[PDB]
Write a protein that binds this DNA or RNA. Structure first.
Lengths: 99, 133, 51, 26
RNA sequence: UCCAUGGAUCUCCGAUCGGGAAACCGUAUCCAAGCUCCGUGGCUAGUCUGCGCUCUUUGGACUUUGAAAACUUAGCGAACUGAAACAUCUAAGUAGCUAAAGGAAGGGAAAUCAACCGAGACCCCGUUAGUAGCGGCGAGCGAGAGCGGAUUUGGGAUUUUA
RNA sequence: GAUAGCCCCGUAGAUUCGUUCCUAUGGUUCGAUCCUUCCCAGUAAAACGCGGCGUGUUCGAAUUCUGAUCGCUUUUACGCG
């Protein structure tokens, strides 16, 4: 629901039971994903950029090698966050500039 | 020449356009800075090859497609994608003698553009580029 | 994780070496301090050209 | 291939259907 | 009178320029190129010779906002009741609410079934059967593959290369 | 004005109506391919919690949807086998 503005890596809250240990009671609850607003560093702008990422997404940006070289990935898989689509197209056009 | 090739195929006659574009290849128009951009649009890159594969070698020989290492990656991609490994290694040695992308660096450069896998089966012409070519 | 150093630094290898390091110790620090870079080839390829 | 090559080239069901059609000729 | 076609006018809210106590109250720009209109300069008055405006209209680009019953697919998600009371279970992924979409939507051409034999996307309708399986192994929940019909479709990326 | 085949209107139908046999062609053909777009992965599993599986979830649950963590898999020999 906040992913509409966050870079939540498709990670999505899940609503389900919680089961007691012995009596077996079922009482509803949710599971909210890890969320740590961070200041990543984008080698295009070379200027810190503050967004609300998960840690799944954090580690993914890491492996791909930073926010920049992570942005240059599948738009029809980032297609969850249209503002993410915008991030991608902007950074890709600025690399175009640097080409 | 434009009028003649127009007679060949603006009327869209196929082998006529073929022989006429071979005649323009033989006409060997300039390829200095923008006339080469005209010549590729006269020999394209890759695709059907055949009659074009001649002006491919030819426009490589005009001076070279060394206008850029990047456009040279485009030209090597064309040569590979025309599945013409022979003309491919030919033009390869051609630029090599003709001030290529500095093989003492162009080696690893082709290595990287090969890890990009954009031009794949030209790994054979790359084995040539690493053994003889 | 690992990165490549744009300059030598204490307790770490020489300038032009590739070095394995800790994730936070790279992202929060040494990435913006601009002392090392990720080893995606786009940067690996710029290192040996800065040298 | 040099590694684990393209799976078998054709979708196994779109090989069985074709071998069925083929042998249907005898 | 009247029919059909096609044209004229065509008040307001809903409403979407701003306000709003619904049916009322407030209101275009920029730029070209058009005659008229209104002073301005020309002093050289020479089509007496020329500039710069406006209200307007054309013709553009700026200037900009859309709704439904059921259906579908999702997000949430309950109790009454059943068990002869009740906490696991049922009710029920129902009621209801929200969001998105089209006239259908989905689903879709095998990291699938079956059992050494074979099959061949997807659904939908019979059947396997209330069978097997689940379950304070209670109450109840309750099939897949396969057979019969409806359908009839695969296509593309593969590319065998000059 | 009572129960209508032939009293009336329609109704069957016949008809008129607007119902297929048909466009070349210049403008120049980005001159019918004188073009080519980004792929091994935080991925499959795994542990826990959940749940969808018509089979309370690993006291026995097989596949499975997802949250936090963590995370795999392969070209090279006298120019040739």
């Amino acid at each position: 629901g906040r992913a509409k503005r966050g870079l939540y890596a498709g990670r999505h809250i899940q609503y389900g039971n919680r089961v007691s240990e012995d009596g077996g009671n079922k009482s509803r609850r949710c599971w909210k994903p890890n969320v740590q607003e961070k200041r990543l560093f984008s080698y295009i702008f070379d200027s810190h950029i503050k967004v609300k990422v998960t840690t799944h997404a954090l580690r993914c940006i890491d492996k791909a090698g930073g926010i920049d070289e992570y942005l240059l990935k599948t738009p029809y898989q980032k297609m969850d966050t249209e503002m993410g689509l915008y991030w991608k197209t902007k950074v890709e056009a600025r690399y175009a500039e640097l080409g | 020449a434009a009028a003649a090739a127009a007679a060949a195929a603006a009327a869209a006659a196929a082998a006529a356009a073929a022989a006429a574009a071979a005649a323009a290849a033989a006409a060997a128009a300039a390829a200095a800075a923008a006339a080469a951009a005209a010549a590729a649009a006269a020999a394209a890159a890759a695709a059907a090859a055949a009659a074009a594969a001649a002006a491919a070698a030819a426009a490589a020989a005009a001076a070279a497609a060394a206008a850029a290492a990047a456009a040279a990656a485009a030209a090597a991609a064309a040569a590979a994608a025309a599945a013409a490994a022979a003309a491919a290694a030919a033009a390869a040695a051609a630029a090599a003698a003709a001030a290529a992308a500095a093989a003492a660096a162009a080696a690893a450069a082709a290595a990287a553009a090969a890890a990009a896998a954009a031009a794949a089966a030209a790994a054979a012409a790359a084995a040539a580029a690493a053994a003889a070519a | 994780l690992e990165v490549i150093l744009t300059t030598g630094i204490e307790k770490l290898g020489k300038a032009g070496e590739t070095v394995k390091v800790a994730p936070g110790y790279f992202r929060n620090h040494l990435m913006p301090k601009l002392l090392a870079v990720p080893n995606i080839d786009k940067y690996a390829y710029l290192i040996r050209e800065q040298r | 291939e040099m590694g684990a090559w393209k799976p078998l080239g054709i979708s196994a069901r779109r090989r069985a259907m074709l071998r069925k059609e083929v042998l249907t000729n005898g």
